Amino acid sequence: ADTIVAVELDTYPNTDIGDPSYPHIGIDIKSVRSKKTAKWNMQNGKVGTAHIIYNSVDKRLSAVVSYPNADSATVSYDVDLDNVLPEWVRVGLSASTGLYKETNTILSWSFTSKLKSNSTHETNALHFMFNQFSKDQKDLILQGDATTGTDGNLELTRVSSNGSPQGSSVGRALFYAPVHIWESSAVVASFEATFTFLIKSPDSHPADGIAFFISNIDSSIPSGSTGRLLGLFPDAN
Amino acid sequence: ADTIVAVELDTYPNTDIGDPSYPHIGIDIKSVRSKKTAKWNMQNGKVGTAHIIYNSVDKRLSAVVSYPNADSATVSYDVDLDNVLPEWVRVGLSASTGLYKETNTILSWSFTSKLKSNSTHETNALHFMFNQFSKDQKDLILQGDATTGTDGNLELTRVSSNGSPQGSSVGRALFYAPVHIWESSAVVASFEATFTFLIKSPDSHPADGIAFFISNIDSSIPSGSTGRLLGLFPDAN
Amino acid sequence: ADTIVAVELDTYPNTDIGDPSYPHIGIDIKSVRSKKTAKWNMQNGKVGTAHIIYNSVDKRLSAVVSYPNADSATVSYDVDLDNVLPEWVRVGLSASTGLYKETNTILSWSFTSKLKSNSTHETNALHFMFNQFSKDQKDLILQGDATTGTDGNLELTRVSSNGSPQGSSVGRALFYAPVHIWESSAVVASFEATFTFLIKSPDSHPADGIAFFISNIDSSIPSGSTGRLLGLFPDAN
Amino acid sequence: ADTIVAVELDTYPNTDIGDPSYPHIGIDIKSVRSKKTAKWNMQNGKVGTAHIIYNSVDKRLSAVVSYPNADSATVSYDVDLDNVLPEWVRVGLSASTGLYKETNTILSWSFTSKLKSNSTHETNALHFMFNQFSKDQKDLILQGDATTGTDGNLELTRVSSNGSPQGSSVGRALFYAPVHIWESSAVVASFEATFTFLIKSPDSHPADGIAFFISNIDSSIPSGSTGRLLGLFPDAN
Ligand SMILES: [Ca+2]
Ligand SMILES: [Ca+2]
Ligand SMILES: [Ca+2]
Ligand SMILES: [Ca+2]
Ligand SMILES: [Cl-]
Ligand SMILES: [Cl-]
Ligand SMILES: [Cl-]
Ligand SMILES: [Cl-]
Ligand SMILES: [Cl-]
Ligand SMILES: [Cl-]
Ligand SMILES: [Cl-]
Ligand SMILES: [Cl-]
Ligand SMILES: [Cl-]
Ligand SMILES: [Cl-]
Ligand SMILES: [Cl-]
Ligand SMILES: [Cl-]
Ligand SMILES: [Mn+2]
Ligand SMILES: [Mn+2]
Ligand SMILES: [Mn+2]
Ligand SMILES: [Mn+2]
Ligand code: NA
Ligand code: NA
Ligand code: NA
Ligand code: NA
């Protein structure tokens, strides 16, 4: 399979696969069964913001999710990502719906990674920022049902011309350039990611969620990874 | 052909094709015959630094080149790059040698472009920084004789194991991700590029130069673009 | 007097002192009589965005102002700022009202300046970004009627508890740290500034405007610089 | 007293006050008796580089120190800095010598802090970078024996015209602008600091060290804080 590290904003509780009985944020190391979660007070049709951070000194992947006028949800996991991921990766956003559904709309997305060597001229850096998505976005790899340019937004899952979200949809956007997360001479490696998102549903139980993820470079949507599998995994192991 | 916008650090004067009778910095809009030049007091075997800047308000491509303890050379050209380049481009470094020769060594390279829209959440940004090049640099497209990882450096032209530069060599490094230089809703578009370079020759007349360039995305080394053509153009028109 | 370089978003036309007969953006070098202007299609109660740019290679102060869904206004002036300003400056925002009035509300403000030396370890940099102003903002010098923390915003001029703008008000916010705009070994010096602003008036003729400005470090509000003088100048010379 | 959080690069082992019996890096929370240390293989007269990182999600102050061609030393402490420091602080560098001595030379210094609110327009940011120190550096507060502009460098302790370090010297440089490390609406607060340093001594036992520190805004050199107290503390408690 692919190798996946994701932060999930998971909107539908699948307690059969270890989800808590509420919407939650999770940290996923090579399994959809989050290694850690925190309760998330999901707001239907409000624009929210996720922040992911990591560095190789502390080896802690943390995330925070918030809406304005609302308290934040936070989650952290101790994990050495050099022991998990290959030295070259792609970073991306994934989403899905199933028999339950929602809009999985990205309004903005930014990523910074730094590799600091032991030489005095130190940093190797990559940073992108999207506040505006464009019909033909050449620096993004779109997979499955992901489209760009509708209202300047990235629609990770299928949404009708009438505004209405479709079920059984899975989509992903990956930044075009590979990211280097380890180096021979690296003394500190850090990254950070922020995305803003609008999840709305005509339903009282929306599904299934959005993930920021890091994968191998040739990572693709796994077969039957709609719904609870979030476009990340081929099974619930 | 390809469409090329380059800043040349041109080490060999080819006065038959309009070069002045000294080493010079030039601004090249779709021709190796610089639209403007300034005298450059090239220092053999010293590490130098080039800076390129542009924005769409002023529509002026400027460049500066310097060595420590030395006065700078500067050059500027009025040019609307939206009238020259396609809206998606790749940016890169190119170099060549011919019957005369030199090391075309890049010690570091960084690039920032911003597209600011009229929406209040404004900037679309890309930034990379390389202070350290790596044997297998996946976020660079190497073309012709360009290699990476020798002393943590990008060698744009061929250099023997003994340190010694080879003639009749042409090489290019292009950043993997396309860069968006125009947008429907763009109010300001700007970029900047800095590279540090070591050009040394056993010869009193080194050749041929280094260029920072912007091209179409599928741009490749033109046939017989060794020597004076700098790996940029198929002819001296 | 103080030495002032400002970009004015000037809402009231004072044609007696050379204003055109419309709202306009201007570039002010040591006088309120803009050296250059462009027509500005000011929108009452809409949030707008100003961008200012400059570098010492081209020696061109340019500005753009925009609202979403609206075309931009632009203005540029050739001026060597090293010949105008001292080598250490403070940068800031100023506003005023007079017998005519408006809210002069800053929602956000960011500034970047770079001094690049000829040494290989090149950049001296300062960057700040405010998206949120706070009751007691210690890194801002507030002058005259400027306050912070009302709705997370900088109110440059006086505004009642009921939301309503007061006349004959002048205020300024200056960043606490001095900015270095020239250096012995400088090869390129550049800066950029962006602010977002909400100007609303119960009046069909609002007054008087907002300026981004650069001054000497001990710069203060000049006596009787309410109204057309924008909190920048002691007279209309 | 003042409130001090420092990362020490401590060159002289004072085992009477809990130093290990070697040069070491330490994390100092309101005491010179590091809460945690790691062995540091200090190199006399070689240029080294320190990196400090922290965020409020993980609440871990970490540091790394390195020389080229050398393995790094690392140290980390779990500490909520909002429980230690006031919401407004100054950040700085300090050094000292005593009966033993060394040059405490800063070649470069950069700092980034971010406060991310729960509003969609999120970040409040401050960043500075010094690669070049200047005779009259207005954006630095120099205290005790600190000077700037000798070889473009910050000399934290006294050094003769002949190059030679003086004993019983203490100096500090603080950035002029206060830094905001906590906010009402903050969801994540992070910072990072890097400085490059040259410590040389004619002595086989150099003293006493360099610290990156964060203090209250009106923090000053404590009386008799030369030598082992590093210009940070009034006593060894
Ligand atoms: Ca689920
Ligand atoms: Ca030539
Ligand atoms: Ca006016
Ligand atoms: Ca000690
Ligand atoms: Cl919980
Ligand atoms: Cl695609
Ligand atoms: Cl598969
Ligand atoms: Cl010339
Ligand atoms: Cl390749
Ligand atoms: Cl060809
Ligand atoms: Cl006009
Ligand atoms: Cl004040
Ligand atoms: Cl006065
Ligand atoms: Cl240890
Ligand atoms: Cl001082
Ligand atoms: Cl004291
Ligand atoms: Mn889950
Ligand atoms: Mn030429
Ligand atoms: Mn005017
Ligand atoms: Mn110690
Ligand atoms: Na958008
Ligand atoms: Na290198
Ligand atoms: Na605000
Ligand atoms: Na220096």
Subunits with at least 3 CB pairs below 8 A relative to chain C?
A: A, B, D
Asked if residue B163 lies in contact with residue B151, where contact means CB atoms within 8 angstroms, the answer is no
Written as one string, the DSSP assignment of C66-113 is: E-TTS--EEEEEE--GGGTS-SEEEEEEEEE-SSS----EEEEEEEEE
Q: Element (H or E) spanning A53, and its range?
A: strand A47-55
| Spatial distance between the Cα atoms of A213 and A191, rounded to a whole number of angstroms | 12
Q: Report the amino acid identity of residue C116.
A: K
Q: For chain D, how many residues are written?
A: 237
- Closest CA in chain B for residue C187: B72
A-chain CB neighbours of B121 within 8 Å are 107-108, 131
| Spatial distance between the Cα atoms of B93 and B195, rounded to a whole number of angstroms | 9
Q: In sequence order, what are the residues at sequence separation of 6 or more whose Cβ sits closer than 8 angstroms to the Cβ of residue B51?
A: B63, B64, B65, B192, B193, B194, C116, C187, C188
Burial class of C45 by CB neighbour count within 10 A (0 to 12, 13 to 18, 19+): exposed
B-chain CB neighbours of D121 within 8 Å are 120-121
Q: CA–CA distance from D135 to each of C114, C118, D89, D146, D217 (Å)?
A: 18, 17, 26, 12, 24
Taking phi over 0 as left and psi of -120 to 50 as alpha, with beta for the rest, B176 belongs to alpha
- Closest CA in chain B for residue D121: B121
Contact yes or no for C118 and B72 at CB 8 A:
yes
Which of B160, B139, B140, B138 is CA-nearest to residue B150? Answer: B160
Token reading at C8: 């004015």
Angle value at C-alpha B18, between B17 and B24, nearest 5 degrees: 115
From the centroid of its chain, how far is CA D114? 19
| B/C interface, count of CB pairs below 8 Å | 78
Burial class of A224 by CB neighbour count within 10 A (0 to 12, 13 to 18, 19+): exposed
C-chain CB neighbours of A121 within 8 Å are 120-121
| Spatial distance between the Cα atoms of B137 and A70, rounded to a whole number of angstroms | 43
Asked if residue A194 lies in contact with residue A53, where contact means CB atoms within 8 angstroms, the answer is no
How many CB atoms are located within 10 Å of the residue A160 CB?
A: 8
Asked if residue B222 lies in contact with residue B96, where contact means CB atoms within 8 angstroms, the answer is no
| Spatial distance between the Cα atoms of B155 and B145, rounded to a whole number of angstroms | 8
Query: With an 8 Å Cβ cutoff, is B154 touching chain A?
Result: no
Query: With an 8 Å Cβ cutoff, is B125 touching chain A?
Result: yes
Query: With an 8 Å Cβ cutoff, is B49 touching chain C?
Result: yes
Query: With an 8 Å Cβ cutoff, is A183 touching chain B?
Result: yes
Written as one string, the DSSP assignment of A142-182 is: EEET-EEEETTEEESS-B-TTSPBPSS-EEEEEESS-EE--
Written as one string, the DSSP assignment of B202-214 is: SSSS---EEEEEE
| Spatial distance between the Cα atoms of A132 and A148, rounded to a whole number of angstroms | 9
| Structure-token match 């020798």, residue found | B150
What is residue B165's DSSP assignment?
Answer: B
Token reading at D89: 């602080």
Taking phi over 0 as left and psi of -120 to 50 as alpha, with beta for the rest, B214 belongs to beta
Which of C177, C179, C174, C171 is CA-nearest to residue C208? Answer: C171
- Closest CA in chain C for residue D196: C121
Contact yes or no for C118 and B194 at CB 8 A:
no
CA D223 to chain A, closest CA, distance in angstroms equals 35
SS3 D228: helix
Residues paired with residue C12 on neighbouring β-strands, in sequence order: none
- Closest CA in chain D for residue B123: D121
- What pairing do the DSSP bridges indicate for beta strands C88-96 and C170-175? antiparallel
| Spatial distance between the Cα atoms of B211 and B172, rounded to a whole number of angstroms | 9
Burial class of C134 by CB neighbour count within 10 A (0 to 12, 13 to 18, 19+): buried
Q: Which of 6-35 (C) contact D at CB < 8 A?
A: none
SS3 B94: strand
CA D174 to chain C, closest CA, distance in angstroms equals 11
Asked if residue B166 lies in contact with residue B128, where contact means CB atoms within 8 angstroms, the answer is no
Quote the strand ranges of chain B, DSSP E. Answer: 4-10, 24-29, 36-39, 47-55, 60-66, 73-78, 88-96, 105-117, 123-130, 140-144, 147-150, 153-155, 170-175, 179-180, 186-198, 209-215
Asked if residue D192 lies in contact with residue D51, where contact means CB atoms within 8 angstroms, the answer is yes
Contact yes or no for B177 and A139 at CB 8 A:
yes
Ligand nearest to the CA of A26: 17
What's the 3-state SS for A184-230? CCEEEEEEEEEEEEECCCCCCCCCCEEEEEEECCCCCCCCCCCHHHC
Token reading at B49: 């630094």
Residues paired with residue A172 on neighbouring β-strands, in sequence order: A94, A143
Q: In sequence order, what are the residues at sequence separation of 6 or more whose Cβ sits closer than 8 angstroms to the Cβ of residue C11?
A: C23, C42, C102, C199, C206, C207, C208, C209
Asked if residue D156 lies in contact with residue D106, where contact means CB atoms within 8 angstroms, the answer is yes
| Spatial distance between the Cα atoms of A186 and A122, rounded to a whole number of angstroms | 9
Q: Report the amino acid identity of residue C117.
A: S
Written as one string, the DSSP assignment of C29-43 is: ESSSS-SEEEE----
Asked if residue C154 lies in contact with residue C106, where contact means CB atoms within 8 angstroms, the answer is yes
A-chain CB neighbours of C120 within 8 Å are 121
Residues paired with residue C90 on neighbouring β-strands, in sequence order: C215
Query: With an 8 Å Cβ cutoff, is C118 touching chain B?
Result: yes
Query: With an 8 Å Cβ cutoff, is D180 touching chain C?
Result: yes
Query: With an 8 Å Cβ cutoff, is D187 touching chain C?
Result: no
Q: Report the amino acid identity of residue B145.
A: D
Distance (Å) from CA A140 to ligand 6 centroid: 7
Asked if residue D181 lies in contact with residue D89, where contact means CB atoms within 8 angstroms, the answer is yes
Q: CA–CA distance from D131 to each of B48, C173, D148, D173, D195 (Å)?
A: 17, 28, 12, 14, 9
Ligand nearest to the CA of C73: 11
CA D42 to chain A, closest CA, distance in angstroms equals 14
Which of D155, D174, D167, D182 is CA-nearest to residue D212? Answer: D174
| Spatial distance between the Cα atoms of D225 and D216, rounded to a whole number of angstroms | 17
CA A132 to chain C, closest CA, distance in angstroms equals 13
Distance (Å) from CA C215 to ligand 13 centroid: 14
Contact yes or no for C176 and D177 at CB 8 A:
yes
SS3 B152: coil
| Spatial distance between the Cα atoms of B157 and C115, rounded to a whole number of angstroms | 32
| Spatial distance between the Cα atoms of D5 and D211, rounded to a whole number of angstroms | 10
Asked if residue A75 lies in contact with residue A36, where contact means CB atoms within 8 angstroms, the answer is yes
Contact yes or no for C128 and D129 at CB 8 A:
no
Q: CA–CA distance from B201 to each of B109, B156, C57 (Å)?
A: 22, 14, 30
Q: CA–CA distance from B97 to each of B65, B151, B174 (Å)?
A: 20, 21, 19
Query: With an 8 Å Cβ cutoff, is B216 touching chain A?
Result: no
Neighbours of ion ligand 21 (CB under 5 A): A 107, 152-153
Burial class of C154 by CB neighbour count within 10 A (0 to 12, 13 to 18, 19+): buried
Q: CA–CA distance from B9 to each of B40, B48, B157, B215, C70 (Å)?
A: 8, 11, 15, 17, 41
What is residue A121's DSSP assignment?
Answer: S
C-chain CB neighbours of B63 within 8 Å are 57
Q: In sequence order, what are the residues at sequence separation of 6 or more whose Cβ sits closer than 8 angstroms to the Cβ of residue B218?
A: none
Token reading at B106: 């890049």
| Spatial distance between the Cα atoms of B49 and C142, rounded to a whole number of angstroms | 40
CA A197 to chain D, closest CA, distance in angstroms equals 10
SS3 C15: helix
SS3 D44: coil
Distance (Å) from CA B181 to ligand 21 centroid: 18
- What pairing do the DSSP bridges indicate for beta strands D179-180 and B179-180? unpaired
Ligand nearest to the CA of B20: 18
CA B176 to chain A, closest CA, distance in angstroms equals 6
- Closest CA in chain A for residue C120: A121
Note every long-range contact of C10-14, with CB atoms under 8 Å and residues 24 or more positions apart, other chains counting.
C10/C34, C10/C40, C10/C208, C10/C209, C10/C230, C11/C42, C11/C102, C11/C199, C11/C206, C11/C207, C11/C208, C11/C209, C12/C98, C12/C100, C12/C205, C12/C206, C12/C207, C12/C208, C12/C209, C12/C228, C14/C228, C14/C236
SS3 D225: coil
Asked if residue A166 lies in contact with residue A100, where contact means CB atoms within 8 angstroms, the answer is no
Indicate the resolution in Å.
Answer: 2.4
Mutation for testing the C interface, residue in D90, D132, D134, D154 having most C CBs under 10 Å: D132
| Spatial distance between the Cα atoms of A69 and A80, rounded to a whole number of angstroms | 34
Compare CB distances from B131 to A124, A134, A152 and report the shortest one's residue: A124
Contact yes or no for D131 and C108 at CB 8 A:
no
Asked if residue C229 lies in contact with residue C26, where contact means CB atoms within 8 angstroms, the answer is no
Contact yes or no for B119 and C62 at CB 8 A:
no
Asked if residue C150 lies in contact with residue C198, where contact means CB atoms within 8 angstroms, the answer is no
| Spatial distance between the Cα atoms of D151 and C144, rounded to a whole number of angstroms | 42
How many CB atoms are located within 10 Å of the residue D84 CB?
A: 15
Contact yes or no for D185 and C130 at CB 8 A:
no
Token reading at C160: 């009642």
| A/D interface, count of CB pairs below 8 Å | 78
Q: Report the amino acid identity of residue A229.
A: L
CA D69 to chain B, closest CA, distance in angstroms equals 12
Token reading at B115: 């597209």
For residue A166, the number of C-alpha atoms closer than 13 Å in the C-beta half-sphere is 15
How many CB atoms are located within 10 Å of the residue C71 CB?
A: 10
| Spatial distance between the Cα atoms of B9 and B25, rounded to a whole number of angstroms | 5
What is residue B221's DSSP assignment?
Answer: P
Q: In sequence order, what are the residues at sequence separation of 6 or more whose Cβ sits closer than 8 angstroms to the Cβ of residue B215?
A: B2, B3, B4, B5, B85, B89, B90, B91, B92, B174
| Spatial distance between the Cα atoms of A91 and A180, rounded to a whole number of angstroms | 11
CA C166 to chain D, closest CA, distance in angstroms equals 28
Domains of chain A in start order, with CATH, are 1-237 (2.60.120.200)
Query: With an 8 Å Cβ cutoff, is A175 touching chain B?
Result: yes
Q: Report phi then psi at C17, rounded to 5.
A: -110, 25
Subunits with at least 3 CB pairs below 8 A relative to chain D?
A: A, B, C
| Spatial distance between the Cα atoms of D63 and D50, rounded to a whole number of angstroms | 7
Asked if residue B140 lies in contact with residue B159, where contact means CB atoms within 8 angstroms, the answer is no
Which of A173, A169, A176 is CA-nearest to residue A149? Answer: A173
| Spatial distance between the Cα atoms of C147 and D84, rounded to a whole number of angstroms | 29
**What is the rounded radius of gyration, in angstroms, for the C-alpha atoms of chain A?**
17
Asked if residue D185 lies in contact with residue D118, where contact means CB atoms within 8 angstroms, the answer is yes
How many CB atoms are located within 10 Å of the residue B10 CB?
A: 28
Query: With an 8 Å Cβ cutoff, is D107 touching chain C?
Result: yes
Q: In sequence order, what are the residues at sequence separation of 6 or more whose Cβ sits closer than 8 angstroms to the Cβ of residue D142?
A: D148, D171, D172, D173
Measured between its terminal Cα atoms, the distance across chain B in Å is 12
As separate numbers, helices (DSSP H) first and strands (DSSP E) second, chain A gives 0, 16
Token reading at A9: 């904003």
Asked if residue D28 lies in contact with residue D35, where contact means CB atoms within 8 angstroms, the answer is yes
Compare CB distances from A66 to D53, D66, D118 and report the shortest one's residue: D118
Q: In sequence order, what are the residues at sequence separation of 6 or more whose Cβ sits closer than 8 angstroms to the Cβ of residue B22?
A: B13, B39, B40
| Spatial distance between the Cα atoms of B210 and B155, rounded to a whole number of angstroms | 11
Written as one string, the DSSP assignment of B3-44 is: -EEEEEEE-S--GGGT--SS-EEEEEESSSS-SEEEE----T
Q: For chain A, how many residues are written?
A: 237
Token reading at C73: 């206004």
